[PDB]
Ligand binder design. Structure first.
Ligand SMILES: CC/C(=C(/CC)c1ccc(O)cc1)c1ccc(O)cc1
Ligand SMILES: CC/C(=C(/CC)c1ccc(O)cc1)c1ccc(O)cc1
Lengths: 115, 115, 115, 115
């Protein structure tokens, strides 16, 4: 899957491997509650963050640790991190792919939402 | 400017006009303190957010109200907003341009940082 | 596969299906010779354009018919098409994935190259 | 202007200076005729390619020499160049700004069209 995060590296032209991703869900008290976490695989993908039943209606934040990624490569990047915040599953179940393309001073994200 | 935010609309091929932008600076208590706010002009640009002297070293969050923009056009977009979070002015004064390209299910941002 | 093309729609947050893709190899007269073609599937993907044996070193042009895609949705887009021109296999056989994210007035493309 | 091209570097967070830009107009033999050329300035901008009087209706190709740009920085990039092909002035005179954001394996381009 219901949630997949895919991260590519625009400098090297490869998947961005081992990028930490933390997901949060907005709580009733308007706090961000830790919902899930993982690291992208060798293919730059992170599957298994949640299940269909667990991925309930709500507002989610997907936080991608871009800074740690670039610093590990010896680069001081511009952004502290990259966040994607969206309402999910408010009109029935969907499969969400959050895709992110990274450069040291830039990132681009899109969502692919299907049945 | 020392800080400029520029927003374009990829559906219409024009500046994104009247987009609300809120800027915050991280406080000692690790809270986000309201730092500035404005709306993009007819050219999709927002100048005059701060001055050189006021734009001190720190971590800033630039929050772009993409959701209100799309909803006003009768579109239900994917993202709640678009945020850009970065350290600024920690190696001398700089001019920052935060540029953002918007589509209903996607945005792309880059920074241009000069002397 | 060694050549894969994937096309996403940034406005609707979906794969772009049935998009015409035409590939060319550069000739010693600087003319562009037809190499292969197809349309994207329901997942927005186009596989099987070529084989590891037909895909020798050269300069290739990948043309994606974005105009037809948009016009069918009732949209009059900016570009005639999106183009990706690159040298392939110059360092020995590789697998290429060309991704294109589409909006009426913008396109973004990236390449993942694997060995 | 009626034709402006602006090129940014997503890796360094700076304008891309001295980037060669070649424009062509499509001919009735489907051949590409030289229309105008130049290099970007220190602000990454190229103005004065053409006049409102030479810029009649037609299909134009804008070619940006991204390869030379990267190789000078010691980087072996993916693309031979970045291309933007579009119909112009078909609805009467307009002003076009073509923006390109560059990374070694990716480019993103958008158009702002004004009347
Ligand atoms: C084209 C969208 C996309 C990407 C990959 C991150 C993208 C995102 C933003 C851009 O500006 C360009 C491409 C992508 C999505 C799913 C994949 O399996 C592979 C690629
Ligand atoms: C090319 C970067 C850029 C933009 C405009 C928002 C951009 C951003 C992300 C992309 O994927 C493509 C273009 C821009 C920056 C300053 C300007 O005066 C005009 C345009």
């Amino acid at each position: 899957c219901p949630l997949m995060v895919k991260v590519l590296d625009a400098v090297r032209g490869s998947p961005a491997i081992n990028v930490a991703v933390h997901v949060f869900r907005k709580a009733a008290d308007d706090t961000w509650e830790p919902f899930a976490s993982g690291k992208t695989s060798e293919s730059g993908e992170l599957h298994g963050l949640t299940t269909e039943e667990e991925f309930v209606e709500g507002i989610y934040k997907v936080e991608i640790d871009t800074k740690s990624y670039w610093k590990a490569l010896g680069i001081s990047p511009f952004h502290e991190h990259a966040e994607v915040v969206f309402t999910a599953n408010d009109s029935g179940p969907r499969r969400y792919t959050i895709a992110a393309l990274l450069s040291p001073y830039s990132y681009s994200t899109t969502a692919v939402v299907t049945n």
